């Protein structure tokens, strides 16, 4: 039988006999999603290019998911890449739900049309006080659903809650998320690895040594093979669909890495773990970094399970 | 004033008062490649998937059936296709394709950028029309590019005129010109390759890889991508400059990529807009091929980093 | 505010803590909808005609599809299908729907204004779903309305909370709430019917029309309108006022169109905006139906223009 | 074999040795004719309800129309419905073709979503003078070409040349317009007529007559059916495709009629008279009135011949 991702969640709630705010908030989070794809393929571009005689793709994107998530009577703290401070849902308009977003991860190579996506996790606000930015500092550990959507070659959006993992595509004919793949699990181990090489001088001494055993196995196995889009979304995907591990590591000149815990390195780890894999610092689980800043950074290493694991048996001879 | 593929052709073709064969076979291509951008974005995918109760072999379709009943070529080469296709003679005309419908496409479960590429040649042979007349070396390319279905769909035409790139407009289905006469950076700062296979690389591509993370004046370092879908690399290439690379290793010892519908292409358009593109012995374009599949290695994209790696690989002898 | 048809209808069964059940149909409804939408606008049309080397029918499938899948329903009743439709057991739900799938569809040919006509009722008994739990009366409905294939795709939904249309926004595929809890003007200037049947019109229609025509009171005649597609000559009924009429006749004693699945809909639009809907003798959401594809006549639109027509009818007995 | 309309004018254009200039004009208002279908459909109008936190329709058609014929550099005169003079293109954008068009018929009832359409009729430039409203001056017999765009159900464009009418369906997925009826030919008889019965009062007296003849037979046989949209582009559409008479006839109180002889009727009688049909103004062809100004009116009966020869039979006996 065919499903659609608000038909999905509305069964899921339902079972569960929610309230139907998580359901809210997510078909909100659709509907910002399936502008965004609008707006990323560069439909009506032709008027801005003078067919009869606005806004940079980044802020568009930022507006869309900010304005339905409001408006969605589902949250009341809001965390964005975009905002240099929690954005604070006016009280009429004030549900219980925690977001932290990327909207347009990957945007500032869009010139070259390399994948986009936008990344989201939702928490629950845990006390009765008045919201402020301080109820978006849990630890990933406290995800109540993350994901994101894939502006590729078609647009996915994936989905994680503690029912698991599932793919749903946009249907651009009709505008419909389809569920097609159910319940997704990474392969325990891959043959693809994922980080920026041409920072080789600057790695720290254990990611150098992981990396020349991919490309130098020692036994007969065949080295792996390297893939970097250089956009978050597209190689955690990748990294997902194929198995294999990413890595944005910390090294001495960014003890802490460069993506964000907030709405990059968490929703990503509690989607790898929702689907079996891992998702690591290098000293701990990134689910459980118990954040003091919205925008700070954390190093992420993910993928498949015998893969991360065995990038911290070389973490660990180096520490 | 606004600019569409189609009337921007006619109008080159007009002033150089050509008979329309190319502009027919051009808008013939620009009509596949939105119907391969319109299933590459899975509309329609819900019927598939129940809602009432092969994506490179559609696209070769497409292509192939688009060029015929455009009644300008005679000849049409694809990667699908382990033969040449010969156009039936009610249907002839004087240009010879060779295409990659769904370049990439092996990868895209993962939703990774595909495109289409092609070449295209006037047959200069008299004979019957045949395999052979599409062995030419790419300087005899009349227009090459390639249409990118990534975030957004973008089409880039390299023709005498030089480089042209048009962003399709989904909600009316037109090619819209919005970068006129490109010209690629002179020196850039990214280098794209597999480096899986650096157990493989001969000791110029070690070397010159060696430069691009160490680099002897102190300079940055140059960052690296690989998308792994030839024409989202090469086209980033062509945005940021840099430079690009597929080169022999040994489970492909006349490198990976196909000469007629990769390499060629890739490499008219980059020399239209003042790149260069090798096989490390020669200009990709000056090979004279002898089998339409064949492959051959290419390093191409900013002049200076061409130059550069060139100064390594004389080293090497 | 921007609202969504989805997001409306969650957020006001919210406030009725409802079970949710409705909810799920009406967005399954929605999802079928785009898809007739997407089909009537003849997406993919190039694939029928060769590009790559029935819709009454589609449409009734994509409907019946939905909602037996959405667990909400049991019983379904369609223009298309000479019995109702019982749905498999784990699949029941409480609702049962009559719709008429692609009203209008026999003049398509000319790409006339086509719709989706839907009534909603609630399961009549415990016992085994049938055929019998359709024939209610239209007062009992719990919502229904109507989606216009027109210049843009509109679906007009009506509930006791008032009638609400939503526009199909096809760039995202998400209907836009833009007009609230509309009404009908009290009197409009447009009267809709066949008069090509003037020859079998009841004296009471002759003279009603004689009326709009030739006003007694020196008022301007009234325009006439009449597309011949229900859903588009009642749409215009709302939105600007008026009268569409499909009268009884002495050949035709209880009209041509539907009770079930087009009047019916339509009455309950029409008194949920404040407007009227008769068959002469009686309201249309008071006949009690004893066949599931029985007709009725109907007298529809703004209340000072029905009651007119009442006196008319009255008049002659 | 598929076809395209621009496919089509180019194979047309190639036989006939054709400078192509008439294939730039038709490609150029075949890409306004796909704006003018994106915006009558209402892509986009999520954003004017503020999802993420402009021009009436008429005026952005008509905006598509001119500029897209402008820099077709095929023009030299346009003539609209929407302004009082014609636009002169600009020297260093002239070329040797007068447009009349109407860019959105119909759209004075476009608030309940009845059909609407584009209508256009093309000359050549008769005159060696320097370029002016003059020149829109032809009679319809000098049509080089003529057509409409109907926005309905889907989108179809209509084109009638020398060669016949042929119907192109728009295929949204991709942009393209589809031959779908090639050389159509309207019936001979047909069983509907088509106007606004409402101004019964003020008809003429013909028009009374033959109207009472069409639901009144006098040979006791089948009554016609009555059919008005109000649209005219979806009239008479409906006119060529089932066949009958569409009447916007004249009477004391507009002795002209009321629709448009250059943008309107004219286009309508060059498709009727390419498809077979007849189009008079009941005293003579719309296509011979000479105009004198280039928003005259004229007097408008037209579809399948012998509806139209009976209705000139009953115009005639009330002489
Ligand atoms: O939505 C609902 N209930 C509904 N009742 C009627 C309709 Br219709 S949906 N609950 S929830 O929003 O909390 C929710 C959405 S997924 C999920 C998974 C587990 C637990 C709860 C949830
Ligand atoms: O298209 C035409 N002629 C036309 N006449 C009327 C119309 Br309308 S198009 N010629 S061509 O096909 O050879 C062509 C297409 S780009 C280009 C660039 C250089 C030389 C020739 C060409
Ligand atoms: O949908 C729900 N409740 C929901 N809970 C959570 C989510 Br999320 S939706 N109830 S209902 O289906 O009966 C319904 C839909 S409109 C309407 C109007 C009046 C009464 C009921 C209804
Ligand atoms: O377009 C062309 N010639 C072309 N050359 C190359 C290409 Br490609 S098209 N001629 S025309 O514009 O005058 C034209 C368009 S339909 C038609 C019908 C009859 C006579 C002329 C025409």
């Given at each position: 039988?065919?499903?659609?991702?608000?038909?999905?969640?509305?069964?899921?709630?339902?079972?569960?006999?929610?309230?139907?705010?998580?359901?809210?908030?997510?078909?909100?989070?659709?509907?910002?999603?399936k502008?965004?794809?609008?707006?990323?393929?560069?439909?009506?571009?032709?008027?801005?290019?003078?067919?009869?005689?606005?806004?940079?793709?980044?802020?568009?994107?930022?507006?869309?998911?900010?304005?339905?998530?409001?408006?969605?009577?589902?949250?009341?703290?809001?965390?964005?890449?975009?905002?240099?401070?929690?954005?604070?849902?006016?009280?009429?308009?004030?549900?219980?739900?925690?977001?932290?977003?990327?909207?347009?991860?990957?945007?500032?190579?869009?010139?070259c049309?390399?994948?986009?996506?936008?990344?989201?996790?939702?928490?629950?606000?845990?006390?009765?006080?008045?919201?402020?930015?301080?109820?978006?500092?849990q630890?990933?550990?406290?995800?109540?659903?993350?994901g994101?959507?894939?502006?590729?070659?078609?647009?996915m959006?994936?989905?994680?809650?503690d029912?698991?993992?599932?793919?749903?595509?946009?249907?651009?004919?009709?505008?419909?998320?389809?569920?097609?793949?159910?319940?997704?699990?990474?392969?325990?181990?891959?043959?693809?690895?994922?980080?920026?090489?041409?920072?080789?001088?600057?790695?720290?001494?254990?990611?150098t040594?992981?990396?020349?055993?991919?490309?130098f196995?020692?036994?007969?196995?065949?080295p792996?093979?390297?893939?970097?889009?250089?956009?978050?979304?597209?190689?955690?995907?990748?990294?997902?669909?194929?198995?294999?591990?990413?890595?944005?590591?910390?090294?001495?000149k960014?003890?802490?890495?460069?993506?964000?815990?907030?709405?990059?390195?968490?929703?990503?780890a509690?989607?790898?773990?929702?689907a079996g894999?891992?998702?690591?610092?290098?000293?701990?689980?990134?689910?459980?970094?118990?954040?003091?800043?919205?925008?700070?950074?954390?190093?992420?290493?993910?993928?498949?399970?015998?893969?991360?694991?065995?990038?911290?048996?070389?973490?660990?001879?180096?520490?």
């Open positions: 039988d065919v499903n659609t991702l608000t038909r999905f969640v509305m069964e899921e709630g339902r079972k569960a006999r929610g309230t139907g705010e998580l359901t809210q908030l997510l078909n909100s989070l659709c509907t910002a999603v502008a965004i794809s609008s707006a990323v393929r560069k439909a009506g571009i032709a008027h801005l290019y003078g067919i009869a005689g606005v806004k940079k793709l980044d802020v568009l994107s930022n507006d869309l998911v900010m304005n339905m998530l409001k408006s969605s009577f589902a949250t009341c703290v809001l965390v964005s890449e975009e905002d240099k401070h929690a954005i604070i849902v006016e009280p009429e308009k004030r549900g219980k739900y925690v977001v932290c977003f990327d909207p347009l991860d990957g945007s500032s190579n869009i010139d049309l390399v994948s986009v996506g936008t990344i989201f996790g939702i928490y629950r606000k845990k006390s009765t006080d008045e919201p402020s930015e301080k109820d978006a500092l630890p990933g550990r406290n995800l109540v659903a993350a994101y959507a894939l502006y590729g070659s078609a647009t959006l994936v989905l994680a809650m029912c698991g993992v599932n793919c749903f595509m946009l249907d651009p004919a009709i505008g419909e998320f389809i569920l097609v793949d159910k319940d997704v699990k990474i392969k325990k181990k891959g043959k693809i690895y994922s980080l920026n090489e041409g920072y080789a001088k600057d790695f720290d001494p254990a990611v040594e992981y990396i020349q055993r991919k490309k196995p020692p036994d007969n196995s065949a792996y093979g390297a893939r970097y889009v250089g956009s978050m979304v597209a190689d955690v995907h990748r990294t997902l669909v194929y198995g294999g591990i990413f890595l944005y590591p910390a090294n001495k960014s003890p802490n890495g460069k993506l964000r815990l907030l709405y990059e390195c968490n929703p990503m509690y989607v790898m773990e929702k894999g891992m998702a690591t610092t290098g000293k701990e689980a990134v689910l459980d970094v118990i954040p003091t800043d919205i925008h700070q950074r954390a190093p992420v290493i993910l993928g498949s399970p015998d893969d991360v694991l065995e990038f911290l048996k070389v973490y660990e001879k180096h520490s």
